Amino acid sequence: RRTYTLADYLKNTFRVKSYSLRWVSDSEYLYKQENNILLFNAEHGNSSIFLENSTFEIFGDSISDYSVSPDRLFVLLEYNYVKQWRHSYTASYSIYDLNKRQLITEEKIPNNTQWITWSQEGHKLAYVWKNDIYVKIEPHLPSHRITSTGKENVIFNGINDWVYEEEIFGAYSALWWSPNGTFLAYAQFNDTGVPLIEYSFYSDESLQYPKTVWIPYPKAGAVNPTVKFFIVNTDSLSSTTTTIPMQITAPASVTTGDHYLCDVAWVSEDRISLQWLRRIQNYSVMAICDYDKTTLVWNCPTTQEHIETSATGWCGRFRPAEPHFTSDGSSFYKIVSDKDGYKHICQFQKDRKPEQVCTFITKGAWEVISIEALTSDYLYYISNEYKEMPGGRNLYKIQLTDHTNKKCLSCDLNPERCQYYSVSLSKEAKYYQLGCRGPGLPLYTLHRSTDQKELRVLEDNSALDKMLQDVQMPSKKLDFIVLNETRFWYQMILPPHFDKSKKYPLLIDVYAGPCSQKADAAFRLNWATYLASTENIIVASFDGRGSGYQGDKIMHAINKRLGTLEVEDQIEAARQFLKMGFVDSKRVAIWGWSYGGYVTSMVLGSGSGVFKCGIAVAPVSRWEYYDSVYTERYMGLPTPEDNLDHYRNSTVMSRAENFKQVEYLLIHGTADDNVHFQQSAQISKALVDAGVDFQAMWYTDEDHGIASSTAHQHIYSHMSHFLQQCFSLR
Amino acid sequence: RRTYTLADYLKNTFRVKSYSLRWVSDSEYLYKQENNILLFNAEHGNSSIFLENSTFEIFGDSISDYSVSPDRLFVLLEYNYVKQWRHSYTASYSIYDLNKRQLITEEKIPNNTQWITWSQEGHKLAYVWKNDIYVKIEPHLPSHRITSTGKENVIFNGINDWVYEEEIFGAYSALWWSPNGTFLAYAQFNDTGVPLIEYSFYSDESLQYPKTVWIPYPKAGAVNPTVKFFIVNTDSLSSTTTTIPMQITAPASVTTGDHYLCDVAWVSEDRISLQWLRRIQNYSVMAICDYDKTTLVWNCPTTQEHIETSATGWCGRFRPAEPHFTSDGSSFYKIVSDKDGYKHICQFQKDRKPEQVCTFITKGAWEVISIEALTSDYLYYISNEYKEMPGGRNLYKIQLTDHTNKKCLSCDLNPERCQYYSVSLSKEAKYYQLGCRGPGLPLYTLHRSTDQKELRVLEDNSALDKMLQDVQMPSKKLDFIVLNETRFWYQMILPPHFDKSKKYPLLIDVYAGPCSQKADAAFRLNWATYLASTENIIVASFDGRGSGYQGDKIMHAINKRLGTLEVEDQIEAARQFLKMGFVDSKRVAIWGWSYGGYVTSMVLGSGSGVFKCGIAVAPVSRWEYYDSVYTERYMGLPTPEDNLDHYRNSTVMSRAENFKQVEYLLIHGTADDNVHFQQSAQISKALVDAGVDFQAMWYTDEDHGIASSTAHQHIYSHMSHFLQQCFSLR
């Protein structure tokens, strides 16, 4: 009869396993086992050593990661990893020759690389160092410098600047090898007119004078970085001191004013697909470009233009979805909202057709989460269609030649244990591995695409299961309440022997940002687990308006006015929970991180009287402080000629007064390059001028995630005690 | 039966009056009455209007202050005051012609002056603007630019750089008019090699991007600014486009390495006195310089050198005391430690004499606080001699011609009400005003120097007295405990009907920095008053080793090792207090600001088990972070060749562990240019790595004094609740 301690959480007492494989072909994959990379034969467990407990130990214990060339001939050894922003980071590398069985030592690779990657084919390498792109046709050979315009915080070649890395692409990389590795496409960013944000860094107590970090960061309405797209021919390198990359210029309907590069996708090797977006993400264009053999130039004829548009809000969930072309690149499938506002799959022809560019292959009041693979006859995707649960994830498949032949491949398997699947098909969809993140303990299995014969079970958390037997785990209800005649899903983490007649304190876990989803069928062991299993607190989340994957009617509901409906609906959800009975209305709280911290703060400052206390970590206090790409996507420009008013209305400080009726805890990281601290600093100041007492806590040199070990532990313990004090427990 | 509320303190319910006069001659003074400057006749209350309720109102309500030329012909009107550091600030000025009865409008004075002042004689003005010195022989006339080397954060002409303003001179000014206004002496500082500290400023929530303030600030051991001393001849100005100032060069025994300018003092008009100090304040030299009429140059012959030295610690209390020359400038009196280490008054002859430069005029185990005036026959000073109370202040006087004719002039007056006097003699000591800060309510009276006949009572707080009748005011014991065979004074603010048999919670109010004094006989209405009158908390302070005015044996006890004895003795004092009975050992706290916050933190982190909780505001966490002039004066240089070890031993972070046994509250101001925040940031981080929970609070854009109105209120309320929570009250 043991509970789930805060220590169980902080020390990670109960490890949850998984099976992260790396398809190397249509029939074999790689898998790390006891610091050994093994090659597995999907079909017969037939295994085999690929890299030993050994190898990795040479470069000390600093071996951050590894990357096997596609032709399985060499292996990249990452080490001396140094983080920088969400995805950026710099490591040192070593190429290990599998065949010759030793480390290539000749033409090494810069001891401070910002990015590196093999071609899709052989053993070609492209890496960015000092903001410049370099190429090595083969591992033993010398580097060919592709660019030289590179310069810190000014010119980025092959890597994204801060805002692009964070809001557009999602990674540091801005390189794209064409299939058959003939070309190498890359983007270039000029951060010149972009303003700077400059926070302090204290470092070891031995540093006598604190450093200062500057970053070209564009806040709402500020001048943004600029782009340029190039494609350099890899094959000529050996016969020149320099090659002259060819530039593609965004489509006219985008060049008139500020705009961004949305996504890159190689169709074939003489055809590439680029997606562009206007600064006001109202409009989007996806041009298809062909390589002219004669004049050695790329053409992006307006006939292959393709326009995406939204009269309700913005394009895509967080940006236009990616296209998936056929072999002959004659057509492509892409997820777009249908006549009803439901993100579905439809076909396109390379050449645009007058208001008929699409033919939907999917219909219904549910949405396609993502396209997973496109065979010559099949299109495997993932949707939240099954059991009308927008919070669930299942793997479907449609026969191209017959859109009727639609079959779910995960819906049966374990309806009880699994309702949230993650997938991963082999190079040519011959086999497919399934990741059950579903309600119960995560379950990984691999099947044979043909008949779905579950070849075997790769990982069932039997171990974690035996362990959790001696612990009083909490439960998780995932249902939905209905407001103004609409389904609105929510979830609750119920403490152990939860008795519907007694009354418990309630903690609302918030996010509620555009296209967010907190109510789902995924298994987790987090802080909320400890809060229910040991403090008997009910932790609930509610996906209200402007959220999830339930159509644009719900998502675009927030458009041009954040800090409105999503906040309100969060309060309503609490009301409703109270009406369910088992909630001690005298002890109801709410917390959130980043966007969630904003809503938390906006709820606490609404004076609805419904909440006692709350905690906001790295909150946003007013949209002018946040970056352009994100903010503007929903708020437009902060100008009288546009949406300045809603900007100035959705301020947290403008609600300082109402905080007198609440115990508030504001937490922020000192080195937060994302949500600047200026944000919380502006809040504390607002409350101080209002004469409202509250509790604060800064985390010296912590990121936007306050995730260093010691900090992570400290911030959760401190938040626990805050709730304990607030709920009269502790 | 009403108590003294936290509101009584914060809103300043009970105003304490005073009488701030401005001697205009040996017989008349100025006094502000209902926004009217009145001229009073010391002798017969004979008054008279000098400036009206009027005048001041023209320049709106922005009239920051006023300054009457010595020849009472014009008045300076300060307005548009903008603070910057402790004493620095910039205002706008207007010269008001008393005679012509209107504002001089012609040759105005720069709308952003950094400093200004009349000559000691007529109506000459010298002011610094844009770091350059300017002169106006008379108010209606045009400015004569004296310097032009001026440049922000680099070259300072006539004003002090940050460290000098803060640690050496105590004011922004670096100008000195000679008597008879012929010359104008000034110092010039080059901040060139001095490193920068750069904190952020957020300002109104409308500022989209936070500013950054940089300041050339030299931390312990860092490169210091450099000095140069000039004297320009004011009389030539009218006959040149430019004048060439003459430079005086510090004495040889100081020029070998880093050093500072200690103090400037004009002896006569052909003789000036400069005091210099080595970077290691072990040594000091006070040269006397004469103006050569022939070669038009100043000479500072080594024969008039004069050397001050300390084999126990540093020179002076916070720097060498100032000299007080005779009329004919043949001799001068200055406060220096005697053979026993007691700061006393002794005579010097312009020319130094081989190890006999001094002749003490004072002896005893008490010290002379300061010299107040030097007549042709009398020397008025202030000491803590009376009743062997080092915490008391009395005005004495000695007949020069007979050192026996020593008489105290304030010791009788009101032994009950007054034990802490402040003085102020007329231009030639014909009359003298007394300021009773003593035990009881402050009492101001003026007397006639001849026989001390108290002419009248200028201010007795009868008003405040009538008011405090209906309030249960706390008492204040000022006694001393004896440790290791030595007197050590302490004081306690006892709650109203204090009953020696019951038991109260204890709050130690700390400072305990070198030459500090918290135990004195001065009347005050502060936070501690509220804490006793309404929370029944005993607030006590203790002057232990390395403190007050009780000889160098006690003061220099800390030398080369801060964060030692002064911390310990503070704990001992608590022990002793407990042994006195009336202290609930289960509820003992301790707080402090700046230096006090350091000791508080060092005590809490000592694991002595004696304290429950504590509060540290803008603390120092390790001496390498604090500035050079201050730190080095007691710690030397942070180098292995000197005192690096004691620097690294006295760290607050090195005691993180021991904080597990304490409720700690760390508070810091965001725009603290004095104690950088880097300090608290380094502490929070230390505790977080130690896994020690604690409470924090930052004050957005607040100074080192967190003294803006809203902030001041907020920080005390928050501290109150912290103690309330800690002491189980609230």
Ligand SMILES: *[C@@H](N)[C@@H]1CC[C@H](C#C)N1C(=O)[C@@H](N)C1CCCC1
């Ligand atoms: C906190 N999560 C901040 C607050 C605003 C925005 C959101 C949501 N945000 C981000 O960090 C975003 N970059 C966000 C990360 C995942 C999708 C976009």
